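Appendix C reproduces, verbatim, an entry submitted by the partner laboratory led by Prof. M.T., so that reviewers can inspect both the input and the predicted structure.
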Amino acid sequence: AETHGTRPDLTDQPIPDADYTWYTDGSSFLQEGQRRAGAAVTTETEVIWARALPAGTSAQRAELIALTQALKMAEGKKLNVYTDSRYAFATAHVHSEGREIKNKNEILALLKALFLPKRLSIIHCPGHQKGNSAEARGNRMADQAAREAAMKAVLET
């Protein structure tokens, strides 16, 4: 049981009985002078969802959006979901009392979506990993799909 959290039964380690294990990533980069971004939810081997996000979108906000989308798609199911983002992890895990100065909308939407899955763990794993370990391949896969989605939309196809 977490405390000063939002969803009281949310955990940070893999639940034995999970139906789904997904990896999420936001990615942001500058191209043609402007900030571009995308978000994705994947397993080790398959892209469940990935989208380009509007110009200006920070990495932080892209990461909230990716994690929020995974929670929605897992509604009613038991989910282990990994993020490489300490900021999305904290936002999910720790309740903040101050009126949000940044990403107020994305944070509000992530917080509502926390309650969708039947059971949930949001786990933070390291990014940029070279392993064939499940997590390594999961996180790589999510990073690649999110960057790819953002790239394809900026280039226009």
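Residues 1-157 form a domain with the Nucleotidyltransferase; domain 5 fold (CATH 3.30.420.10). Additional entries are available on request from the coordinating office.
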